[PDB]
Design a protein around this ligand. Structure first.
Ligand code: HEM
Length: 134
């Protein structure tokens, strides 16, 4: 749980194919365009990132919770098995997701790494209400 990242990035080898890292400019890692830029996230806002085809669910939830800025404790949950977070949260059963990867062995190890890439947590903040605070 010692959330590495060394191990965390190694594994990213398991998101890379759906997912890009890139920055407002160049690309750390290199990954399929299926899924969004995974860079930033941590600090972000569920589904913000523009010009992608977000699954309708994350979309409505981002909505019910104009709040949610992907901590990385959310990252841990989500990726673990995302429907059960997405869903649960809208309460609307029949999540859907566009993400089907289920990752159940090394969670924090990863959020760790992705916490890092999105360097802004700003030392601290911008809000609070649990789950959010970004
Ligand atoms: C553990 C490796 C990966 C992690 C850590 C991960 C993380 C995430 C996160 C945090 C989101 C929500 C972002 C937002 O709110 O915008 C997301 C959305 C998504 N992911 Fe992944 N992901 C992983 C692997 C993959 C893979 C392998 C695929 C393709 C096979 C994929 C497809 C998607 C899609 C389509 C969405 C959009 C969901 C929607 O709009 O409703 N992901 N992912």
């Amino acid at each position: 749980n010692e959330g590495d990242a060394a191990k965390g990035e190694k594994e990213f080898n398991k998101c890379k194919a759906c997912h890009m890292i890139q920055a407002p400019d160049g690309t750390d890692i290199k990954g399929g365009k299926t899924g969004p830029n995974l860079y930033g996230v941590v600090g972000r806002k569920i589904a913000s990132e523009e010009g992608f085809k977000y699954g309708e669910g994350i979309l409505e939830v981002a909505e019910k919770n104009p709040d949610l800025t992907w901590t990385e404790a959310n990252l841990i949950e989500y990726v673990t098995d995302p429907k059960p977070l997405v869903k649960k949260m809208t309460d609307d059963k029949g999540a859907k997701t566009k993400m089907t990867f289920k990752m159940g062995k090394n969670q924090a190890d990863v959020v760790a790494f992705l916490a890092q890439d999105d360097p802004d947590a700003x030392x601290x903040x911008x809000x609070x209400x649990x789950x959010x605070x970004x």
